[PDB]
Structure 1
Amino acid sequence: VSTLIPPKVVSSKNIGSAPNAKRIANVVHFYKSLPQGPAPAIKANTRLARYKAKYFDGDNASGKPLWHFALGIIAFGYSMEYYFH
């Protein structure tokens, strides 16, 4: 009798399935990426990247670096008032 049946030859399931494209993508995309990723810039070494570390971090939305940076410009024209007068 008939021993002809679906199971003996299978090769349509092993390409036809949709997650294969995603699978082979993410073995290439992921295998070496960091499991988190590192923190917003904090030191580039110039002796002012340390200034960034305390105030002007990406996680800081606090008004402190703004105040500090603003205050520098106040010091410039105020002295120059006394340099011109």
Structure 2
Amino acid sequence: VSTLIPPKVVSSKNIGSAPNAKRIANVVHFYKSLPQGPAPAIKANTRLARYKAKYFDGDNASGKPLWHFALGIIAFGYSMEYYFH
């Protein structure tokens, strides 16, 4: 006798699958993400975004700003030594 009609309705393998939850997530997350960004280091732009670019990028952990800032404090109280002299 005639083969039954349950297989001709699908709406329980289309909404009844687990990656649907991931699908609706990653259509929003990925589709709505700019493939590229603006600029990594730019804070303090006044030729001191350049200071950030040379020293406070994630492209270096080089000791130069530390040295520079340290030397600043040496310059601060030392000048004041000759101001207090």
State if a TM-score over 0.5 links the two structures. yes
TM-score range normalised by the length of the shorter chain: 0.7 to 0.9
Q: Count residues in correspondence.
A: 85
- 2:14 partner SS: helix
User: Where in structure 1 do 4 or more consecutive aligned residues deviate above 4 Å?
Assistant: 36-39
Deviation per residue, 1:37-63 (Å, 9 max, x gap): 566424541221211111221221111
Contact 2:42 2:49 in 1 (8 A): yes
Moved more, 52-61 or 27-36: 27-36
Pick the structure with more helix per residue.
Answer: 1
Q: Percent identity?
A: 100
Q: Which has the higher contact order (CA 8 A, sep 6+)?
A: 1
Output the CA distance in 2 between the equivalents of 1:39 and 1:59. Answer: 13
Deviation per residue, 1:21-77 (Å, 9 max, x gap): 100111011113133556642454122121111122122111111111111111011
Q: Which runs of 5+ in 2 are unaligned?
A: none
Contact 1:42 1:57 in 2 (8 A): no
Q: Which residue of 2 aligns with 1:8?
A: 8
Output the CA distance in 1 between the equivalents of 2:43 and 2:77. Answer: 30
Q: Which runs of 5+ in 1 are unaligned?
A: none
Cα distance, 1:54–1:60 mapped onto 2, change above 3 Å: same
| TM-score in terms of structure 2 length | 0.83
Output the CA distance in 2 between the equivalents of 1:33 and 1:69. Answer: 38
